[PDB]
Design a protein around this ligand. Structure first.
Ligand SMILES: Clc1ncnc2[nH]cnc12
Length: 115
């Protein structure tokens, strides 16, 4: 509360670390469904069903231009990529399995890096 400060977690390396995690996700072989925004004009249903589209290139642009206030907002966009993937694809499709694999990959990097 006012004039009563909790001890400050060091956040100075957060930007660099999130960038490294994103690089590792960008270069994963199962990243291909997520590298670019879904083509809303070539994919039936996507625009109406998925209210907040997200993809790795959009996360990268946001990270490079100061649009994440903190590391949790970055993690929210990453998870949104995989949540959107689950909403729209069957678990036993290639894209569906790719999403599950990438989420697992991310969350371990997240835990190892920050937790
Ligand atoms: Cl690139 C692409 N095409 C169709 N559905 C998708 N879900 C996630 N990425 C997708």
């Amino acid at each position: 509360s006012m004039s009563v400060k909790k001890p400050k977690r060091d956040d100075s390396k957060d930007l660099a670390l999130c960038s490294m995690i994103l690089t590792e996700m960008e270069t994963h072989e199962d990243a291909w469904p997520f590298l670019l925004p879904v083509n809303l004009k070539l994919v039936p249903g996507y625009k109406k069903v998925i209210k907040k589209p997200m993809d790795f290139s959009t996360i990268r642009e946001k990270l490079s231009s100061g649009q994440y206030p903190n590391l949790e907002t970055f993690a929210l966009d990453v998870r949104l990529v995989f949540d959107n993937c689950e909403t729209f694809n069957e678990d036993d499709s290639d894209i569906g399995r790719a999403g599950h694999n990438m989420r697992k990959y991310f969350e371990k990097k997240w835990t190892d890096t920050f937790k």
